[PDB]
Symmetry: D2
Subunit: 255 residues, 4 copies
């Protein structure tokens, strides 16, 4: 593309291995102004250190726990006060407990099921609503999903149902904001070594299955997700909404 | 398909228009012993009255609000004490607040979003968990979904996202409970005038458009969901699990 | 219960045909069965297989679906010999052996069109002809494989023919629905049939299903026929343009 | 997405309105070298006049009728001799007789059905086989489909079954050629006023409905298909294969 004079909000960089950091690098390289949101003080610390590798002349950092309507509302409001209107949001946030992930799915607790939904799916809805106010002439919103939202994948358990929820959330949001010229899409990333990935049982062996079985016979990386993100966040993908692009070496397409 | 010496639990008859009552008439007509569960007082009364149409020699009625683990745990425990091992469960339960079935999806409240997940999806997981205890030999579990879980349908809003979640729940339950010989499937019913259908904006429209546009050129009814449920709840459908069967006059197949 | 129901069953070759699984189940449910075979060999064979069933008579018709006239005259005769029918079970497909292994991208025009012709287009002509014999509606069921939905190694040109057959179903459903003819697919798991010898690495798939499918076991022709009973009968009123996976749950997992 | 020192074969321009000339304008814009294939001498004459609006310094025009193995085989071979190694093929080719694009699908002739399959689906397979010869390094093949491939759309009839075939063709080519680093994907375009769209009953109606019912509330144009083509044919889409991107204002996602 080329993304000068554009401003994107990126949510969910924890460290250098975060998918959303792959997005950040690509967008930053393409001329975009970036604004970053985080939950833990530690993620902010990592952000401050990761910005040195970037071209951003300014640190634009905001603490937003997507569990709190107040923090999302006040965050996006302060972002508009600081940078003005924006062109899109990359959503890269999910959560579930260990204790429910390494259960039989049937043994999942209600509080863990809903926690997963709340952070991993609902949060897009409220982010979309608040971000929309900073997009008076339209823009783009991308969330990150995984194929365990379309099929039942051993171990992914509660997070699979939260992804199914997220992928519909995208479709309903696309229907709703469409007339506002806001596009909403999902990237279905293949497995990537991240901090959150350490929490999913059997991650390593799925990695390996991908190399053996996927059409491109290899795994993907954060920058690949970031390149597809730039497509979805740019004018290149006008006409595309409610879509789910698999960035996964073609693994979605086989059995 | 003869069901004598089978026992099924049917969840979510409110009145004679309920989908689950379509299911009950079919199962009863085929010789099954039936247990029913309800939430409201008013629903148990309706059930008491509706039983006079059935061949069920006794009434097995249980109050189970699926918002409560204790009620589901204790309910299914009582069922096992009163009737013994069962052969399957029909789940016909969902809820969302009125203002979440119309206007704009992007303005869905967090509590409204999570409420719909809890009742309309999570409840399957917990029901399957407890119903399993009564199926040492294997059995069958069916839940009721709608096309709006697969596609954004105007006005179906927060329920669309809960049916997406429910549909994934079915897949993950099938994967989990499969080795125990417990099948888990969905019926995706077409629009049908029920009490809950009154909370969905634009329902009359969707009905007409089915008559005009679906293959069979006519809407379905509860008995037709019922005969598909009989198939899934019986040995006719051994080998079928994690499936979603559209009983919607072919509407799912066109565009 | 299918008493005074009459169904045409296409593609029995031997005791292991999926269509024989369907036959036994329908026969068991009291239905009258007409069979269609392709070459005289399957005739002496079929004749022997029906000594198992409860059919009082052999209604047996050679139809190679590569010929319009054999499909046209075939159904025309069935109507004269037996009267109106209640549905059709399609259990028919073909591809040349060299196209069912190695490299899809190396498939010949002729071998690709052959597969389309027999495995997909034949449904359309069968439906048009069979419709003439179901004035009050009826039910048509074809057999597919998950390979028409996902690319499955080795299945190759047959996967593109099945994808074709699954859309044919959709389109037959839309077109024939106002006549009350329902059209559906059963997507069967793998089963040791005569024709599955020709698919590369079929034994490797058989074992994957056992290891990985929700039911942790494979399916048989009888389970396929039980689901065909549902689809061919009134139990499945309301359901058309559908593809039901009788596959120990394999389609739902990745 | 800068495409200098890239070369793409664009198959199936007939006039200023062709979807493939959308692609061409876009790829040309981004600095690619372009090679055109046509069938009818009139499509060459049209290409020659449209070349004047491109920045291409030379005309590279081949006559390939994809019904001929020999013509595909010799066309591509020749292309290799003339411009050397290519980066991708954009396939924008389909055909069906007018009878079989209206009225009753069940009345499709054998001959019409195979003719649609041959031109509209099989051609991709042989084009990929021959084009693989000019991509020893890897590359990108994109074919043009329509939602009629995934659902029954009234009137689309024999072509929809041909587009199903094509979409599956894309999936199998992606499995087969992934190990050679050749990505194969499909763009599912919304309805667009072209020469070949004049053959399809009820085309005007579908246009109007997309406007009323699709999330963006507008039709897409050829240039929007080109912008997404540029993405699929470039490194921006490096982890994407066996995929189908709907450039259709959202329509695919709604029911
Ligand atoms: N890695 C993969 O294999 C893979 C594959 C497909 C899809 N995905 C999806 O990709 C996205 C990014 O995950 P990742 O793999 O990049 O892992 P990650 O680096 O661990 O990032 C996850 C992010 O989620 C944020 N988060 C969790 N709860 C939050 C909350 N309540 N409020 C605000 N932020 C919250 C974390 O912030 P804090 O650390 O500050 O708490 C962290 O930045 C997730 O949606 C994941 O499900 C990942
Ligand atoms: N009608 C349609 O067009 C349609 C189409 C597709 C799918 N569906 C689905 O079919 C199922 C049955 O709905 P329906 O149309 O038959 O409407 P219905 O008659 O209103 O039944 C809904 C039932 O859900 C029960 N329920 C709600 N919350 C509950 C809770 N917390 N605990 C226990 N029970 C609870 C209700 O019980 P109480 O009244 O006692 O509170 C009522 O029995 C639902 O899953 C619905 O989403 C309906
Ligand atoms: N077995 C599996 O794992 C599997 C799984 C999923 C789907 N299927 C499908 O199930 C169906 C039945 O196959 P099967 O596995 O049961 O194998 P089968 O016993 O070999 O039956 C296949 C039948 O197709 C008939 N046939 C082929 N071309 C014909 C033509 N041109 N005209 C008339 N009949 C023709 C064969 O006839 P002749 O012997 O007379 O040549 C044979 O009766 C096929 O559609 C197959 O694609 C099979
Ligand atoms: N327009 C739409 O709404 C729409 C929507 C989605 C997808 N599509 C698809 O987009 C692609 C391009 O179509 P279009 O709408 O842009 O129509 P178009 O401008 O009429 O182009 C169709 C092209 O197909 C070529 N063609 C037909 N048979 C051929 C053969 N045997 N060998 C070589 N070329 C052949 C034609 O070449 P000649 O004129 O020289 O014969 C023509 O250039 C097709 O796959 C179509 O199915 C169209
Ligand atoms: C067997 C599983 C296959 C590998 C899964 C690939 C994958 C890895 C990490 C993911 O991220 C999370 C996972 C669980 C809980 C929170 C997050 C977060 N954030 C994800 O969504 C998907
Ligand atoms: C967009 C209009 C399409 C017509 C929708 C068909 C339909 C009607 C009623 C349904 O039931 C509920 C709906 C909302 C809340 C609770 C329940 C319950 N129980 C349902 O799930 C689907
Ligand atoms: C790697 C794939 C695993 C096994 C696939 C299961 C399968 C077995 C047999 C099939 O039948 C045919 C196959 C080829 C040609 C004709 C027929 C016929 N008739 C089929 O369609 C699918
Ligand atoms: C029911 C109307 C649906 C709207 C149609 C969208 C559409 C328009 C034109 C298309 O192109 C062809 C159509 C038929 C035959 C050849 C070609 C070619 N080339 C296409 O594939 C799809
Ligand atoms: N993370 C480990 C532990 C999972 C478990 O034992 O449940 C794995 O790859 O499975
Ligand atoms: N149930 C009425 C009211 C809709 C509304 O305005 O919310 C309908 O949509 O026809
Ligand atoms: N072009 C006409 C076709 C006319 C017909 O098939 O009757 C239409 O828009 O349908």
């Amino acid at each position: 593309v080329n993304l000068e004079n554009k401003t994107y909000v990126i949510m969910g960089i924890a460290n250098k291995r975060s998918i959303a950091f792959g997005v950040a690098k690509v967008l930053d390289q393409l001329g975009a102004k970036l604004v970053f949101t985080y939950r833990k003080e530690r993620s902010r610390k990592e952000l401050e250190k990761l910005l040195e590798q970037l071209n951003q002349p300014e640190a634009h950092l905001y603490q937003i726990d997507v569990q709190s309507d107040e923090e999302v509302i006040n965050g996006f409001e302060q972002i508009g006060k600081d940078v003005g209107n924006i062109d899109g949001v990359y959503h890269s946030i999910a959560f579930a407990n260990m204790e429910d992930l390494r259960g039989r799915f049937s043994e999942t607790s209600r509080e863990g099921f809903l926690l997963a939904q709340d952070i991993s799916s609902y949060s897009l809805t409220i982010v979309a609503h608040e971000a929309k106010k900073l997009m008076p002439e339209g823009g783009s919103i991308v969330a990150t999903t995984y194929l365990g939202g379309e099929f039942a994948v051993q171990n992914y358990n509660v997070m699979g149902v939260a992804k199914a929820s997220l992928e519909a959330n995208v479709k309903y949001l696309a229907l709703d904001l469409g007339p506002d010229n806001i596009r909403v899409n999902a990237i279905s990333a293949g497995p990537i070594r991240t901090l959150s990935a350490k929490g999913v049982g059997g991650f390593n062996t799925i990695l390996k299955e991908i190399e053996e079985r996927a059409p491109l016979k290899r795994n993907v990386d954060q920058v690949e997700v970031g390149k597809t993100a730039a497509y979805l966040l740019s004018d290149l993908s006008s006409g595309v909404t409610g879509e789910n692009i698999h960035v996964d070496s073609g693994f979605h397409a086989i059995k």
